[PDB]
Structure 1
Amino acid sequence: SNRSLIVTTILEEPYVLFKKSDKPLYGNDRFEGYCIDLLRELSTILGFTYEIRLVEDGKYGAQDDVNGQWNGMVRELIDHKADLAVAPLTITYVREKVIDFSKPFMTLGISILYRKGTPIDSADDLAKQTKIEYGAVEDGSTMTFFKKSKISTYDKMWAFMSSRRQSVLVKSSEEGIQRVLTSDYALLMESTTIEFVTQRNCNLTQIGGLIDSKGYGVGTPMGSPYRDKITIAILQLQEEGKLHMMKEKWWRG
């Protein structure tokens, strides 16, 4: 009741980072970022104290296809090792079956990162040609979406990416961003990342709108009383304009 909540999280720019500071920093104050700002607001609104812990396996949370066991922050919640996961944890069907998410504090989707000043305006324009290469970070959520879409355009896109995978799937986002900057290439990625990048790379832009729709939510264990309280607090923060301010604080270049 006066117990501190254990908050699992993971390093991910600009959601959660170690703060650079002149002053000495102790404990939770060693961290900063959008999710840390959100956590601070939630703790004030709902009146809890907390302890931030970085997740032991450096994973968000997936289910093993052979033994059915979870990992990452999702596993910490399932096992009641954490009270909250405050991180850009995507709200998905498979996860929502095993933990309880708040309503989303951010809604987003897959989109396209490309250089400015071209006539390409959609995923369709990319799908119906071969001169401009395009791809994604190998094994990421975005690539996974394409590997599964039965939507026409996206199925064609995956045909291309899969065949030319040694050429167009990259091992990291920075590798991908450099390819967009130095060659005739477009990168499929989450729109939150694209915005972060385009605020810092004035010669790049998002192409088109969103290709899918999904949200990031605060994770709680199934049955947690904090889930609905956090949802109401998030909705109020949104309506008051405060999450929008928080987003601009951490994303603007």
Structure 2
Amino acid sequence: KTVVVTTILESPYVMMKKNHEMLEGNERYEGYCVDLAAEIAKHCGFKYKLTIVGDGKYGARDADTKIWNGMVGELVYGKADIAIAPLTITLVREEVIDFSKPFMSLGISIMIKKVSPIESAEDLSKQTEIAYGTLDSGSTKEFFRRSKIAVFDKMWTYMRSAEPSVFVRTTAEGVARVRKSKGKYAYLLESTMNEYIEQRKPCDTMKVGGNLDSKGYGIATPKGSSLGTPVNLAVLKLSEQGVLDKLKNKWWYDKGECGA
């Protein structure tokens, strides 16, 4: 029995190869998440098929309709049996799906065009001259919405009541917006994504300040599934054996097509 895997087109997690016209099956994908899924399948011993979620959504809740979208919605409604993807472990998501142990630590970071005048997020919130936003239907926007710390509340009130729409559909779109804003737009995204972008050409973006908080990516399964314990054990074994270190080094530092 094959296992349907839902992923999202994200670099360096899932890339759609470069010469994929003649490729079929799982061989048309590449990235950290593809290798992680291969190792998970090898450890557990099942045959899997990689699939891209129809909507490029990580997972959220719509306007008071109690319907999950994206990869979380794909898992909840039985469309997929596992989600190997950069899916943040959050309280709201844990109540509907099971998360394994985190395989990669991360945090919220600020990305701007290439001493910065803002640096820390407090100066970013205090100064309204520059604009900042997040990725829609994600986990950073949900972090800012449900936050209670005053600086996060004022940041969220800025972003929600902003003209025009400060949110972006895809992190690539937000990166392009930051690059084309001539240093007038700031991006709030995951630290790993910011590092990967800043270590790649044309190297016109960079990360400022520290990390607002710390989270992690987990491998998600439908609630009450029979694969949660095997994937948890496989993730623990891979972390102990240094496979995750090797994969991160391969997909984040080994290429490094930038001078730094």
Common fold by TM > 0.5: yes
Q: CA deviation at 1:177?
A: 2.5
Residues 138-167 of structure 1 show CA distances to partners (whole Å, capped at 9, x for unaligned) of 63533443344221222233344445x226
Q: Structure 1 residues 139 and 51 mapped into 2: Cα distance closer, same or farther (>3 Å)?
A: closer
Residue from 76, 80, 96 that aligns with 1:82: 80
Greater fraction strand: 1
Q: Work out the number of aligned pairs and report it.
A: 248
Q: What 5-or-longer segments of structure 2 have no aligned partner?
A: none
Q: For 1:238 and 1:82, locate their aligned partners in 2 and report how far apart those are by CA, in whole Å.
A: 25
RMSD: 2.6
Q: For 1:128 and 1:76, locate their aligned partners in 2 and report how far apart those are by CA, in whole Å.
A: 39
CA contact (8 A) 2:113 2:183 kept: no
Q: For 2:239 and 2:197, locate their aligned partners in 1 and report how far apart those are by CA, in whole Å.
A: 24
Q: CA deviation at 1:128?
A: 3.3
Residues 17-43 of structure 1 show CA distances to partners (whole Å, capped at 9, x for unaligned) of 211248953311111111101001111
CA contact (8 A) 2:58 2:137 kept: no
Task: Say if 2:250 is the partner of 1:237.
Answer: no
Task: Say if 2:188 is the partner of 1:188.
Answer: yes
Q: What 5-or-longer segments of structure 1 have no aligned partner?
A: none
Equivalent in the alignment of 2:229: 228
Greater Rg, structure 1 or structure 2? 1
Q: For 2:21 and 2:204, locate their aligned partners in 1 and report how far apart those are by CA, in whole Å.
A: 36
Residues 204-252 of structure 1 show CA distances to partners (whole Å, capped at 9, x for unaligned) of 4322222122222111111222112111211222222221221222223
Q: Structure 1 residues 65 and 45 mapped into 2: Cα distance closer, same or farther (>3 Å)?
A: same
Identity percentage over the alignment?
50
CA contact (8 A) 2:103 2:217 kept: yes
Residue from 154, 159, 170 that aligns with 2:152: 154
Residues 24-73 of structure 1 show CA distances to partners (whole Å, capped at 9, x for unaligned) of 53311111111101001111111111112222344333334433232332
CA contact (8 A) 2:110 2:207 kept: yes
Q: For 2:167 and 2:21, locate their aligned partners in 1 and report how far apart those are by CA, in whole Å.
A: 39
Quick one: which amino acid aligns to residue 209 of structure 1?
G
Residues 175-219 of structure 1 show CA distances to partners (whole Å, capped at 9, x for unaligned) of 432156x22443222212211111125454322222122222111
